[PDB]
Design a protein around this ligand. Structure first.
Ligand SMILES: *[C@@H]1O[C@H](CO)[C@@H](O[C@@H]2O[C@H](CO)[C@@H](O)[C@H](O)[C@H]2NC(C)=O)[C@H](O)[C@H]1NC(C)=O
Ligand SMILES: *[C@@H]1O[C@H](CO)[C@@H](O)[C@H](O)[C@H]1NC(C)=O
Ligand SMILES: *[C@@H]1O[C@H](CO)[C@@H](O)[C@H](O)[C@H]1NC(C)=O
Lengths: 99, 50, 109, 72, 127, 49, 109, 127
């Protein structure tokens, strides 16, 4: 009769507001402003940087990437407790009438 | 379980061990998706821009 | 998201004038993307300095730039009468945007 | 991904049929045997490696079936 | 040898849609970048336009994020710049830019000598 | 001469704006609006009801 | 984020009518906290029902109620003339707060 | 035998701070919380209150958490509201409300009964 959902997975999503931020070798990780939301999915990794990138020291820098994670299709996992649910059962006697 | 226009009857421990970005069933204003890293990927082919 | 160069500088033809710009630890003090643009009052601006110090063709090898931490200096040696332009500053930041200077006014007398 | 762990060995089954039985009941044997006929050299390799270790005559067949079944 | 001419605007209304173009010639347009910048008179160069490319990508400038829409074209070798929902401070002078793109197609890393050439200035008003 | 910071740490902190949220047994997990922000610190635990 | 009981309801004396109110899974949908308050206009509001179906001492057994997930009800069996006052619902969220419904003024004729 | 009397403010212009008082009598004041609800004439009941104890903690409403503050003194057995920054729409009757704290002193979960015993109702107006 009355279920209550416990966990909503999602199926199809999209990523908007995509942005990235990098920082020079050996002087720390980058810091992006919208890493603070838990909407934006984050990933730190290391790019190669040097004078052509405009930093110096010729090493492997750090980089971060964020994009806002919205949703389009969900599923709902509804659950019940073994009360408040009924079974409908039919009891037809014999000695059949027409059709 | 209840997808777009169908529905099934799945095991509970199977349903909780299911890798997709989820959200609690009481979470109104569903912005904080939790394991979002199972529906994104991060392309760093060379050692350049990802 | 801005730059803090002084609004007006002065100097006689023969002496040197320097213009500093204080930036944060992401746009100027970390990266070597610091540019300088003057602007005539009747003409569009033009490129004058590369990454830190280097120059394009055109301008006659007088202007030298430097970076002293979070300050970016524009050294001018041998002032003239046709250099009363608006020396703006520029910096490519870390997130991906470009910030600019407010403006300098230059005279000789 | 989620196409793995396909909700099979749970119990929970009744006389009415499942979502896709009679299709997803012979998919894994068809999949591993089109894999065998399109990658035979690993089956030769598992035949030599399975025949080498495993002394008694049933261990060759069991280790051979398991080695050709783990690699998809 | 490189000249960037623009398109002029006569008079607009706060709330209407101003529009400015740039006829770029003398070089290869299909693999460079085109910015757009606004200069209030005697004030800071507000960087309006975004990182156009051969496919016309975007980089959302924070102050002008939900009030400008830009496009491009390749068959005319021009760039497009239009600003809807004007007000009584958008009346200023406009300019253009030039920058080369990395050979893999993508342009996030800028090159060292950015902003090589500029436009000429087309003044906009309000009424 | 010219230094550049690597990693800032936090010697001393203060906590304000405590909001809690607790839900029924065998019905999912709790969910609160300020869990989306990452200034807030969070922990899931088990009360009996 | 208030509850959604209707504007008003009517009943002849002797009837057995109901007053409904909906909500969300934090208000009514999980918790057994729902209360009702009768409020005569020149009077402080007096509570009619405890947690879902219980009842204070002094309140007659005419008043009853139940819950059906997100929706809670109140059934008055045997309307008399002294039920001419609006009934405000109540709840307690998972968040920690308290909400009340809109109010259903009940006429007896 | 449990009586909770109040005190009425006459007329407060918008801007002035107003405070009301309830004199809880008939029970141990330190082992019962003290809630505050309001009712404009012909509208709903919304919940202003906080969660007193012998501790003196608070839990304000989300609507105007930055508006109200408290004080109390168990030596006088009275709990005090403090509503500063009175506005034009704030003409309402302010009711008193009690419920029981836990036996451990704190107020974590409420009792199943909330407001078995009530107050009078304090009317404020604007001018
Ligand atoms: C199952 O029972 C229904 C209900 O009686 C049968 O439907 C009737 O069919 C006759 C055919 O002459 C009609 O005159 C009636 O009006 C129908 N009653 C209804 C629709 O309620 C139906 O035929 C039976 N099915 C079978 C296979 O015998
Ligand atoms: C994403 O970009 C759009 C572009 O207009 C902007 O309106 C929106 O505010 C941005 N989102 C965030 C979270 O910054
Ligand atoms: C934190 O607390 C202060 C005072 O209690 C309040 O003004 C502020 O809004 C709170 N912060 C948030 C994000 O609610």
């Amino acid at each position: 009769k009355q279920p209550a959902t416990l966990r909503k997975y999602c199926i199809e999503a999209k990523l908007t507001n995509t942005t990235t931020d990098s920082r020079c070798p050996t002087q720390g990780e980058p810091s992006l402003n919208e890493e603070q939301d838990k909407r934006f999915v984050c990933k730190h990794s290391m790019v190669d940087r040097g004078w052509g990138n405009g930093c110096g020291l010729f090493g492997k820098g750090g980089i971060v990437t964020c994009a806002m994670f919205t949703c389009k299709k969900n599923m709902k996992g509804k659950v019940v407790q073994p009360e408040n649910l009924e079974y409908t059962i039919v009891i037809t006697p014999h000695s059949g009438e027409e059709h | 379980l209840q997808m777009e226009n169908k529905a099934w009857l799945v095991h509970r421990q199977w349903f909780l061990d299911l890798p997709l970005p989820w959200l609690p069933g009481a979470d109104t204003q569903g912005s904080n998706w939790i394991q979002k890293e199972t529906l994104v990927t991060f392309k760093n082919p060379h050692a350049k821009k990802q | 998201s801005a730059l803090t160069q002084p609004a007006s500088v002065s100097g006689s033809p023969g002496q040197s004038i320097t213009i500093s710009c204080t930036g944060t630890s992401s746009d100027v003090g970390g990266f070597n993307y610091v540019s300088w643009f003057q602007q005539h009052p009747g003409k569009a601006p033009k490129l004058m300095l590369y990454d830190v110090t280097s120059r394009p063709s055109g301008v006659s090898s007088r202007f030298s730039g430097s970076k002293s931490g979070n300050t970016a200096s524009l050294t001018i040696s041998g002032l003239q009468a046709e250099d009363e332009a608006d020396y703006y500053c520029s910096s490519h930041t870390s997130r991906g945007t470009w910030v600019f200077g407010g403006g300098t006014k230059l005279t000789v007398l | 991904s989620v196409a793995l762990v396909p909700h099979v060995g749970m119990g929970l089954e009744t006389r009415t049929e499942t979502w896709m039985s009679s299709e997803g009941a012979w998919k894994h044997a068809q999949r591993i045997e089109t894999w065998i006929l399109r990658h035979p050299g690993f089956t030769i390799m598992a035949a030599i490696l399975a025949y080498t270790i495993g002394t008694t005559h049933f261990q060759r067949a069991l280790i051979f079936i398991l080695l050709t079944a783990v690699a998809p | 040898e490189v000249q960037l001419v623009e398109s002029g605007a006569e008079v607009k209304k706060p709330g209407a849609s101003v529009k400015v173009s740039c006829k770029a010639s003398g070089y290869t347009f299909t693999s460079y970048a085109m910015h757009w910048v606004r200069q209030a008179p005697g004030q800071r160069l507000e960087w309006m336009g975004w990182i156009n490319a051969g496919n016309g990508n975007t980089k959302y400038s924070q102050k002008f994020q939900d009030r400008v829409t830009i496009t491009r074209d390749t068959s005319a070798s021009t760039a497009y710049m239009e600003l809807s929902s004007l007000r009584s401070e958008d009346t200023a002078i406009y300019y253009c830019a030039r920058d080369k793109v990395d050979d893999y197609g993508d342009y996030w890393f800028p090159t060292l000598w950015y902003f090589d050439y500029w436009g000429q200035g087309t003044l906009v008003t309000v009424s």
